[PDB]
């Protein structure tokens, strides 16, 4: 459902259209809390937007490149450029609202 992405293939994965990138970490309970919400979101947009995951401990470059300081952080990409940032826990509704704002 949700495709993993790393420093190595970020640029090729996030390059065209809309992607919602979830910057998470295994030591953060809040990331674990939104995981299921994103799996359901990814299904609702099974062809409009891609939902990716990036583990910040294994990919500090990318996390650093977009000034990701606190997590979870969710960034919406439009044709390779970040256009929206969401910090903390958010219910499916609030996230869907943000995606529709760019589709």
Curated annotation (Swiss-Prot):
SUPFAM superfamilies, sorted: Thioredoxin-like
Record carries keyword Disulfide bond: yes
PROSITE patterns recorded: THIOREDOXIN_1, THIOREDOXIN_2
Cysteine pairings via disulfide bonds: 28-31
Domain called Thioredoxin: residue spans: 1-103
Induction comment: Expressed in both aerobic and anaerobic conditions.
CDD domains found in the cross-reference section: TRX_family (cd02947)
This protein's GO CC annotations: cytosol
Entry keywords, A to Z: Disulfide bond, Electron transport, Redox-active center, Transport
GO biological process, one term: cell redox homeostasis
NAD found in the keyword field: no
Molecular functions per Gene Ontology: protein-disulfide reductase activity
Family membership: Belongs to the thioredoxin family.
Annotated function: Component of the thioredoxin-thioredoxin reductase system. Participates in various redox reactions through the reversible oxidation of its active center dithiol to a disulfide and catalyzes dithiol-disulfide exchange reactions.
Protein name per UniProt: Thioredoxin
């Amino acid at each position: 459902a949700i495709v993993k992405v790393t420093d190595a293939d970020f640029d090729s994965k996030v390059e065209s259209g809309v992607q919602l990138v979830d910057f998470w970490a295994t030591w953060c309970g809040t990331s674990k809390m939104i995981a299921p919400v994103l799996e359901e979101l990814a299904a609702d947009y099974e062809g409009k937007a891609d939902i990716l995951k990036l583990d910040v401990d294994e990919n500090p470059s990318t996390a650093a490149k977009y000034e990701v300081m606190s997590i979870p952080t969710l960034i919406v990409f439009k044709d390779g450029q970040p256009v929206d940032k969401v910090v903390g826990f958010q219910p499916k509704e609030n996230l869907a609202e943000v995606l529709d704002k760019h589709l």
